[PDB]
Short mmCIF file of C-alpha atoms in Angstrom, two decimals:
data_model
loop_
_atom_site.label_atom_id
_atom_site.label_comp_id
_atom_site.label_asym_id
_atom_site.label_seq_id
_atom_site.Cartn_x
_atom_site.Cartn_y
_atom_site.Cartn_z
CA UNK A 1 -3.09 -5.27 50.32
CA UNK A 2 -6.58 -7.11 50.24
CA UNK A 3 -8.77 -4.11 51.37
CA UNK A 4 -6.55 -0.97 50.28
CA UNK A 5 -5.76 -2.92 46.88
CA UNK A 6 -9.77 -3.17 46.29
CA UNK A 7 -9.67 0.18 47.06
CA UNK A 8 -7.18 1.56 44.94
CA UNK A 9 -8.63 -0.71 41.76
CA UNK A 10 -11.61 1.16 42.77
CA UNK A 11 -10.03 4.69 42.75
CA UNK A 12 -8.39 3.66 39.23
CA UNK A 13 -11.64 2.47 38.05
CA UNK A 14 -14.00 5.39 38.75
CA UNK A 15 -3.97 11.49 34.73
CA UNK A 16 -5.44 9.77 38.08
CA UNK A 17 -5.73 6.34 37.02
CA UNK A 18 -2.38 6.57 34.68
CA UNK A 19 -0.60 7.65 37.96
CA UNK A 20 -2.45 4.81 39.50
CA UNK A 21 -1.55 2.35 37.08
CA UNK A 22 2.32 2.77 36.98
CA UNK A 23 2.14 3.00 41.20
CA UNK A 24 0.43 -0.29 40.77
CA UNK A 25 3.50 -1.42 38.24
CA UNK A 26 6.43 -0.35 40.58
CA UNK A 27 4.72 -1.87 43.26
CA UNK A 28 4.33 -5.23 41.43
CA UNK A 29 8.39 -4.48 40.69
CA UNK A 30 8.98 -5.21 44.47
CA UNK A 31 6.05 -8.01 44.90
CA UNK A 32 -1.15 -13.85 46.88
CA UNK A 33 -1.24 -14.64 44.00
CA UNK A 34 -4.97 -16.05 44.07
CA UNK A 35 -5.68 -12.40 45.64
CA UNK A 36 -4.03 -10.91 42.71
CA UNK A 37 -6.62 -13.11 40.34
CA UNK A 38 -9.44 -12.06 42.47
CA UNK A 39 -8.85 -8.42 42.05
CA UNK A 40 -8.01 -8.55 38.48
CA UNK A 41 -11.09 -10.18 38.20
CA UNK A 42 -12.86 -8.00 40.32
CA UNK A 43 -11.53 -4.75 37.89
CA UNK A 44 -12.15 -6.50 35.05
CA UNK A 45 -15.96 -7.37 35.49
CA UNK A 46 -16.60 -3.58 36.30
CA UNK A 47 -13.92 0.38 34.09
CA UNK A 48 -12.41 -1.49 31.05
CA UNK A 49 -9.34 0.41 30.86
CA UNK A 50 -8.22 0.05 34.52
CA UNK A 51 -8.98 -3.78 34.54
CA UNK A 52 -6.52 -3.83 30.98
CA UNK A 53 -3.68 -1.74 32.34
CA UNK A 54 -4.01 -3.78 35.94
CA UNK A 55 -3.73 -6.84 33.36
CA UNK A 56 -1.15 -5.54 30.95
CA UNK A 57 1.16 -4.33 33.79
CA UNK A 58 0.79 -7.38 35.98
CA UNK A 59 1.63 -9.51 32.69
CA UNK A 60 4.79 -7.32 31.89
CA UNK A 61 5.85 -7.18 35.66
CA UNK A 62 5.10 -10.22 37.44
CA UNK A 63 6.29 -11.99 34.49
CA UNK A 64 4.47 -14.73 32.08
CA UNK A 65 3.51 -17.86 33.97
CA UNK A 66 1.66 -21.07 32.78
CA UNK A 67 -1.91 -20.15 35.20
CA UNK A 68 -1.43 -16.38 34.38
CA UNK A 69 -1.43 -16.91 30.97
CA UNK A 70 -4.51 -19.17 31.08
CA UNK A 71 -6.32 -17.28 33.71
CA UNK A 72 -5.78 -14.40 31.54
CA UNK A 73 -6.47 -15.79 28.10
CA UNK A 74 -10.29 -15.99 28.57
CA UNK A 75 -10.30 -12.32 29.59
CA UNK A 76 -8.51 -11.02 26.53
CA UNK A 77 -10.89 -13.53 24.54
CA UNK A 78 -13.82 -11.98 26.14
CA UNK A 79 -12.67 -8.34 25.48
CA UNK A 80 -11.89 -9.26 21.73
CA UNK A 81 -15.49 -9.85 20.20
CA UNK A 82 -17.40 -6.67 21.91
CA UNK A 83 -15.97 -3.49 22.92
CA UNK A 84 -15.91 0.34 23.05
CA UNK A 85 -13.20 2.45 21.15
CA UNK A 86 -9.89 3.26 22.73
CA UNK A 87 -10.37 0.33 24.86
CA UNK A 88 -10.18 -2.05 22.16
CA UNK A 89 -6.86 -0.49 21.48
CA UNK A 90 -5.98 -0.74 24.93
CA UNK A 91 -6.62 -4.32 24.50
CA UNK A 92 -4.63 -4.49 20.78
CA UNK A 93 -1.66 -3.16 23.29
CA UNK A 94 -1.91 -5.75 26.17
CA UNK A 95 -2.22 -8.45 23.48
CA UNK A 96 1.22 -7.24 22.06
CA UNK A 97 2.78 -7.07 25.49
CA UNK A 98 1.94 -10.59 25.97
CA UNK A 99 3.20 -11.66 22.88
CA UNK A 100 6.61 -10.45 23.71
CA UNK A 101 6.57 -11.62 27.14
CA UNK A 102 8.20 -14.65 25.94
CA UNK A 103 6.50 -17.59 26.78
CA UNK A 104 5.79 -21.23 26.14
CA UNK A 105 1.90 -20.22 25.20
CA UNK A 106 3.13 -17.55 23.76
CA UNK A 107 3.33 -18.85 20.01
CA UNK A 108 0.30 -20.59 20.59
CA UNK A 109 -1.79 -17.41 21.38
CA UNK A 110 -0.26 -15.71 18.39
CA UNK A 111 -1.26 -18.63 16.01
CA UNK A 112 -4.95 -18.96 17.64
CA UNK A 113 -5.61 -14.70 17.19
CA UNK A 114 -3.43 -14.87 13.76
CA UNK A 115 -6.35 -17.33 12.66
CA UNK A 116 -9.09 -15.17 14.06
CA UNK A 117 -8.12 -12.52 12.23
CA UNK A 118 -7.62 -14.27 9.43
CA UNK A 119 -11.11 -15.71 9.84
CA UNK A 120 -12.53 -12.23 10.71
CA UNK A 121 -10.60 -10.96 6.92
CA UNK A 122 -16.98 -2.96 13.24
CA UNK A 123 -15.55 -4.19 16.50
CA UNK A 124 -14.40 -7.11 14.96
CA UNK A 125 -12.55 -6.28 11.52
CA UNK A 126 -10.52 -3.30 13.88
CA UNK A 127 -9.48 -5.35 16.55
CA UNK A 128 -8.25 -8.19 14.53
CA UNK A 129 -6.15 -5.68 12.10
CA UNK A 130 -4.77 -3.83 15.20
CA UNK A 131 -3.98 -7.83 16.29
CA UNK A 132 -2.25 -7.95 13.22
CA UNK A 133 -0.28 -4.99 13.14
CA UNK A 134 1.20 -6.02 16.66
CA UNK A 135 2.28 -9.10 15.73
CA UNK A 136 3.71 -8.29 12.57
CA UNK A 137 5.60 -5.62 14.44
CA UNK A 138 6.77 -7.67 17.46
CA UNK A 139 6.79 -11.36 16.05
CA UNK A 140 8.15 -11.20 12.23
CA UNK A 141 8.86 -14.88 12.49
CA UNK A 142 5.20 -16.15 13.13
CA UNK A 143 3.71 -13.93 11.00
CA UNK A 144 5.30 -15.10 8.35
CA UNK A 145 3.57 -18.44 8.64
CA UNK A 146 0.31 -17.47 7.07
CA UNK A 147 1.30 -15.32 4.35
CA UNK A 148 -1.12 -16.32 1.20
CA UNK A 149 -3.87 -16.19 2.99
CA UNK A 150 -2.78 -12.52 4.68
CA UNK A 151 -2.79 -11.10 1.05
CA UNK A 152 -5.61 -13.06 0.12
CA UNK A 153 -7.88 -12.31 3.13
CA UNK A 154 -6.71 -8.38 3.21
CA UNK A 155 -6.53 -7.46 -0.59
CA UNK A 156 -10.12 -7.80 -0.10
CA UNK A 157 -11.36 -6.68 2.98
CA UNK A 158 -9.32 -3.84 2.37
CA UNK A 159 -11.33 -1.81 -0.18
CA UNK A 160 -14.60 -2.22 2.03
CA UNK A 161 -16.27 1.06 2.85
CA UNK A 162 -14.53 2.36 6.08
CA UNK A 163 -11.80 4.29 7.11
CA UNK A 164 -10.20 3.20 10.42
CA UNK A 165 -10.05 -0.66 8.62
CA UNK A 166 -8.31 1.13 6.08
CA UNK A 167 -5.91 3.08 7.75
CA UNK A 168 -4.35 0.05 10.16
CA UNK A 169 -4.68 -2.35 6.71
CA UNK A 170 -2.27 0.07 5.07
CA UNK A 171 0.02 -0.26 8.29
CA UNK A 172 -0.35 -3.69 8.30
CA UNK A 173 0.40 -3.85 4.37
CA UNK A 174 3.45 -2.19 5.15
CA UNK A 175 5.00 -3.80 7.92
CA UNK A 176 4.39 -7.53 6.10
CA UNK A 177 5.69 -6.02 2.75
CA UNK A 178 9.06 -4.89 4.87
CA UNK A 179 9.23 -7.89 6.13
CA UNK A 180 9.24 -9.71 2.67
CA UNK A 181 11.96 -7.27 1.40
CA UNK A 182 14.32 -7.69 3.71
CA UNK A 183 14.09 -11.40 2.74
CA UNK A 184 3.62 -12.12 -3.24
CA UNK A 185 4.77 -8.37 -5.14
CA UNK A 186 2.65 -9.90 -8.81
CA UNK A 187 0.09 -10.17 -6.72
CA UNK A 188 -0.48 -7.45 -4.64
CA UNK A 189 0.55 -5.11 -8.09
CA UNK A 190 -2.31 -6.91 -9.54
CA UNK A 191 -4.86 -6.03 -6.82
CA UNK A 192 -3.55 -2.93 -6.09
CA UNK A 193 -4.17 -2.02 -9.62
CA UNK A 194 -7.40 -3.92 -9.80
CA UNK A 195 -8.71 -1.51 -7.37
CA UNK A 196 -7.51 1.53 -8.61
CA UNK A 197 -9.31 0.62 -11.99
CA UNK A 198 -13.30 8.07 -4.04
CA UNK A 199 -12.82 4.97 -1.61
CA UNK A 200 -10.35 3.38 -3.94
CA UNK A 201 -8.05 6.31 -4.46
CA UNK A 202 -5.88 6.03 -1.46
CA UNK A 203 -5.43 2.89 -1.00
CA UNK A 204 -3.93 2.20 -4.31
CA UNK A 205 -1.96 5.11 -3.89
CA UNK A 206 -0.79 3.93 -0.86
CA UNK A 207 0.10 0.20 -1.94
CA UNK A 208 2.28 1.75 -4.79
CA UNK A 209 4.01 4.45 -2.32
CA UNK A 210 5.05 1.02 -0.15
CA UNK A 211 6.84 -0.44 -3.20
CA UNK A 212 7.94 2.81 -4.08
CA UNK A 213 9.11 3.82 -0.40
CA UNK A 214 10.48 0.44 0.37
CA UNK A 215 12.52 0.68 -3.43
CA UNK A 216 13.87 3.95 -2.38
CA UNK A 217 14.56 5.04 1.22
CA UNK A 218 15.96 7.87 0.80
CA UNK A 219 12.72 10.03 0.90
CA UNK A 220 11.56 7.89 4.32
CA UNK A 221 14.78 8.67 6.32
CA UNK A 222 13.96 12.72 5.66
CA UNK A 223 10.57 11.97 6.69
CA UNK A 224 11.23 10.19 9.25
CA UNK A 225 14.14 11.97 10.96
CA UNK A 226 11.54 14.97 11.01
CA UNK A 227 9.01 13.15 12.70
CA UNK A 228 11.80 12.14 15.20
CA UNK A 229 12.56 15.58 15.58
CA UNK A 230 31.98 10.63 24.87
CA UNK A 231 34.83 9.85 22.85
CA UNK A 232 36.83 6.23 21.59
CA UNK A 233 40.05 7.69 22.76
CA UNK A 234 38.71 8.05 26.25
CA UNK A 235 40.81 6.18 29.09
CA UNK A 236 39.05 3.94 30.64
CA UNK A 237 38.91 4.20 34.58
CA UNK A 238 41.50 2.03 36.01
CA UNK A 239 38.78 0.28 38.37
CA UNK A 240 36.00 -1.03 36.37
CA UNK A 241 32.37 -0.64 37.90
CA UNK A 242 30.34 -3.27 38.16
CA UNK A 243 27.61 -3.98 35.30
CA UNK A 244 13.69 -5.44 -9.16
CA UNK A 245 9.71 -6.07 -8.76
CA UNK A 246 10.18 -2.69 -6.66
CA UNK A 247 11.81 -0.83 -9.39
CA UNK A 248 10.02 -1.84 -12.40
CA UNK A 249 6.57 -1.31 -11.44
CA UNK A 250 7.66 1.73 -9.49
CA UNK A 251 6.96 3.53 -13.00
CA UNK A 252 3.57 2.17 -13.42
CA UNK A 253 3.08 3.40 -9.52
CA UNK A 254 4.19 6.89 -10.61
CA UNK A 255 2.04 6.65 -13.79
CA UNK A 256 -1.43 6.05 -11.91
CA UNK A 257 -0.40 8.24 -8.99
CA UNK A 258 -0.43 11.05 -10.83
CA UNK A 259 -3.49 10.81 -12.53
CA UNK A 260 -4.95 9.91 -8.82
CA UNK A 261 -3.45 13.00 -7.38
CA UNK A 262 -4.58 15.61 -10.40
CA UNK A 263 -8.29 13.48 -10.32
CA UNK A 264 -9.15 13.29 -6.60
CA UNK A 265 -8.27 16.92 -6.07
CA UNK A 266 -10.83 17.47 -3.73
CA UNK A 267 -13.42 14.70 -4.07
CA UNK A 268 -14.31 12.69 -0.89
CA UNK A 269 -9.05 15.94 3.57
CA UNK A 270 -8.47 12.37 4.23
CA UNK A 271 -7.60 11.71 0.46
CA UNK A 272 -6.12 14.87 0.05
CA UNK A 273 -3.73 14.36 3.23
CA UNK A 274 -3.09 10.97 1.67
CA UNK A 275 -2.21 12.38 -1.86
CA UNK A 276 0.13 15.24 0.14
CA UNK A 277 1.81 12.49 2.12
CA UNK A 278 2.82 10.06 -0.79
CA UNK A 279 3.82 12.33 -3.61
CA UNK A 280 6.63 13.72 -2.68
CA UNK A 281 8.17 9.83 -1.87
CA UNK A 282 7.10 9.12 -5.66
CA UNK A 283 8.70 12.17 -7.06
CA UNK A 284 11.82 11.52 -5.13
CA UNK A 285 12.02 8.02 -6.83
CA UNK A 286 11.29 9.79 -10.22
CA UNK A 287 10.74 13.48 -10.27
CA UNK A 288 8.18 16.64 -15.85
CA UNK A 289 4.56 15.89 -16.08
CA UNK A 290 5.02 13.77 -13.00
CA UNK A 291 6.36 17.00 -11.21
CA UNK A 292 3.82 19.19 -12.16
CA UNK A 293 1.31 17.08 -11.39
CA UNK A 294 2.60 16.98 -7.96
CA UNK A 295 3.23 20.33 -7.51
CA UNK A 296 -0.05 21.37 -8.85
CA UNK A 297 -1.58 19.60 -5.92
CA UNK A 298 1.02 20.34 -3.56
CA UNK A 299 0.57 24.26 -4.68
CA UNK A 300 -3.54 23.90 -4.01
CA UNK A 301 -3.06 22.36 -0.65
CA UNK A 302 -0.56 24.72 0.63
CA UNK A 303 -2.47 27.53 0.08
CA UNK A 304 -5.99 25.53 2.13
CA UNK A 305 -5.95 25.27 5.39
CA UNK A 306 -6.20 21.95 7.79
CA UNK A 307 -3.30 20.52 5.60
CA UNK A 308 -0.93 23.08 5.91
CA UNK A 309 1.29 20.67 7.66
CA UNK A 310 1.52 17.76 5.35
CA UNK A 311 1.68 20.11 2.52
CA UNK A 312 4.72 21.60 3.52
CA UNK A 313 6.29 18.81 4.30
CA UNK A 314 5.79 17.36 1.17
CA UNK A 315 6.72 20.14 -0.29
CA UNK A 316 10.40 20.43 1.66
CA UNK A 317 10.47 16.77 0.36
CA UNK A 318 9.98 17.92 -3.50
CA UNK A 319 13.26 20.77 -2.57
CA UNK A 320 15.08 18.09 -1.63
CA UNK A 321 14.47 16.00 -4.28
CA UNK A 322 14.15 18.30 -7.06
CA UNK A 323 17.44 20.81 -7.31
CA UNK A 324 17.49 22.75 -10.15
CA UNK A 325 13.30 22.35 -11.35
CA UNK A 326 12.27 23.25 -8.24
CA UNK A 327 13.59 26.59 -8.17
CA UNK A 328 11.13 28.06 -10.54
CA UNK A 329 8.01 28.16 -7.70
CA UNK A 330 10.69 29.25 -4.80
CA UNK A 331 8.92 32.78 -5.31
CA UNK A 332 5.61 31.40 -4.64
CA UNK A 333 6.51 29.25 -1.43
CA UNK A 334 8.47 32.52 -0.05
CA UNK A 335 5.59 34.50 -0.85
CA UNK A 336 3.21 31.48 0.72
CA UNK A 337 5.47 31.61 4.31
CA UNK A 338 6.04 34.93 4.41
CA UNK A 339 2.30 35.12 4.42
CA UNK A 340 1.88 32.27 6.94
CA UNK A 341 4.15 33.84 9.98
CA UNK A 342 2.61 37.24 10.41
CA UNK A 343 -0.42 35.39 11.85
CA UNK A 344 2.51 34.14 14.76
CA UNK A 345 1.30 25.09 12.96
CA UNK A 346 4.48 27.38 11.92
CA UNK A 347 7.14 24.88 13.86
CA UNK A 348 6.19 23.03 10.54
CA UNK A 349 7.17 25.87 8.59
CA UNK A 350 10.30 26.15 10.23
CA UNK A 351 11.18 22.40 10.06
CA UNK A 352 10.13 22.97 5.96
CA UNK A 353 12.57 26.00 5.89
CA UNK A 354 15.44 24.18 7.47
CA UNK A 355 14.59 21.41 4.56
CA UNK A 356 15.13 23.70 1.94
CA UNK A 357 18.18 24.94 3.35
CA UNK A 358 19.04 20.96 3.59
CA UNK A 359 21.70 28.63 1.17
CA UNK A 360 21.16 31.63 -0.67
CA UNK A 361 22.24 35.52 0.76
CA UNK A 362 18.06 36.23 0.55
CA UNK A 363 18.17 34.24 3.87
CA UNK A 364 19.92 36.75 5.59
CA UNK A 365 16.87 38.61 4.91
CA UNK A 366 14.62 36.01 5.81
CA UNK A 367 16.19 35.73 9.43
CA UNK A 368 14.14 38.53 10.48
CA UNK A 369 10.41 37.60 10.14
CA UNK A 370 11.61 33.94 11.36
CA UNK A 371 13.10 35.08 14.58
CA UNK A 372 10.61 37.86 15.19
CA UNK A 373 7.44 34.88 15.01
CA UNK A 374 8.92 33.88 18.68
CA UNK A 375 10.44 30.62 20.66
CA UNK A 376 10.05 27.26 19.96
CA UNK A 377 11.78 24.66 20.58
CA UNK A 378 11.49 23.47 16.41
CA UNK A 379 13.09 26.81 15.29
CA UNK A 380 15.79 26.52 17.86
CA UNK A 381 16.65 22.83 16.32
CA UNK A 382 15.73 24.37 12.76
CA UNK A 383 18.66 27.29 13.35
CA UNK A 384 21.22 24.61 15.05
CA UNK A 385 20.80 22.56 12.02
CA UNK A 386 21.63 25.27 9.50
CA UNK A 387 24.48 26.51 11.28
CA UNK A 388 25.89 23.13 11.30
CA UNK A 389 25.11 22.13 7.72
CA UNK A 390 25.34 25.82 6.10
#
């Protein structure tokens, strides 16, 4: 559109620009091509965000081409070193889109940024673990080619002083330890442990929880169905349409998680939403004095505020996993949401509720406070769910 496509890159540039975007995407459906440099070119040197979804959505459209892919590469290369936040996940994104375009360069791109990052192991450190994350997601089969020096490189930039390095490290950790599973554990027991002997609380915690979580994943499918939350005998029509290491240092992760859990109380929210999320995974490995150390913190959290969430969920979690122990604090966590719903955050509370049901005549009882808090569309799925299982 020469003019009115300057234009519109302009509009996007300076809700609006999504809408813009994704016009710009079904329009490159249908649909020069040095024009199309130009104005990338144009959006890019002006801001960041437009000229990255322009980029990203040509890329994914238009499809991967030889001059596309180089024209492009120097851009993203550019963008890598120096950027602002959001953007540089914005960036993270378009990288991953490219690397499951499917292309010749393809592999080559994801070896030269797998070595960057591995260089790199803070504009820098971010961007090359979001990088990393991406690629471990989309392309399991290169990044398994540098494995040692992954571990090597991470184990310790890891326990550096920062929290968003931490946080994608952990993702990171997880996605290349699922990866080995499914087909290296010494070591990253050893550093894990290392470490562990207020920064290097959770990310101990966290290592063991992946060997523990990956051991066992029957505590991640409850967890994660939560977050998430015809017929064979039909006749077809007559015209058819056209178309081990895991388990026995699992103890030891136990062991030093519930000393972490009873010690970093309330030291340095982050930690405590850490300590929230991974203890209930442990206990449902193993649930005594690993249970009360749980619940202790479970209990405290429950009761705070800005964690209400993650406690409870953790705390449905320990019902689940713990039958007949369990039922000795059931007065306490009635007490606790009976106290919580009058206020009506609580869609939580629900979710926990169903969990627990996941039974006795006290919830006949119980159905009035629940239904008199109001409509949403959690209790609706909450009270489907217990009708079908109870």
């Amino acid at each position: 559109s020469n003019v009115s496509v300057l234009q519109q890159f302009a509009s996007g540039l300076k809700r609006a620009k999504a809408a813009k975007e994704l016009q710009h995407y079904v329009t490159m459906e249908l649909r020069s091509t040095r024009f199309y440099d130009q104005l990338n070119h144009h959006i890019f040197e002006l801001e960041r965000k437009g000229g990255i979804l322009a980029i990203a959505s040509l890329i994914g459209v238009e499809g991967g081409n030889a001059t596309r892919i180089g024209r492009f590469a120097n851009y993203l290369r550019n963008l890598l070193p120096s950027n602002d936040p959001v953007v540089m996940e914005m960036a993270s994104k378009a990288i991953g889109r490219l690397a499951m375009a499917g292309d010749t360069f393809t592999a080559e791109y994801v070896e030269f940024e797998v070595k960057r990052a591995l260089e790199w192991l803070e504009g820098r450190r971010h961007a090359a673990v979001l990088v990393l994350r991406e690629l471990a997601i989309s392309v399991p089969t290169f990044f398994f080619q540098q494995v040692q020096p992954f571990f090597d490189n991470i184990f310790v930039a890891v326990w550096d002083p920062k929290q968003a390095i931490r946080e994608g490290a952990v993702a990171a950790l997880r996605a290349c330890l699922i990866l080995t599973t499914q087909r290296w554990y010494r070591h990253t027991f050893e550093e894990a442990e290392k470490g562990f002997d207020d920064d290097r609380i959770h990310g101990a915690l966290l290592i063991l929880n992946e060997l523990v979580r990956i051991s066992s994943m029957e505590g991640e499918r409850l967890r994660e169905e939560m977050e998430e939350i015809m017929g064979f005998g039909t006749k077809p029509r007559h015209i058819t349409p056209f178309t081990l290491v895991e388990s026995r240092c699992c103890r030891d992760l136990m062991e030093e998680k519930f000393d972490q859990v009873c010690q970093w109380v309330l030291k340095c929210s982050l930690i405590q939403m850490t300590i929230l999320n991974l203890l209930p995974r442990l206990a449902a490995f193993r649930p005594t004095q690993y249970l009360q150390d749980t619940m202790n913190h479970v209990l405290s959290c429950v009761k705070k505020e800005k964690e209400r969430t993650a406690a409870f969920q953790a705390l449905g979690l320990l019902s689940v996993a713990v039958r007949s122990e369990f039922k000795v604090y059931l007065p306490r966590v009635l007490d606790i949401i009976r106290a919580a719903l009058p206020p009506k955050v609580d869609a939580t509370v629900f979710t926990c509720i169903s969990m627990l049901a996941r039974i006795q005549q006290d919830i006949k009882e119980l159905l009035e406070p629940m239904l008199a808090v109001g409509l949403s569309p959690a209790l609706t799925a909450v009270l489907y769910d217990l009708s079908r299982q109870i």
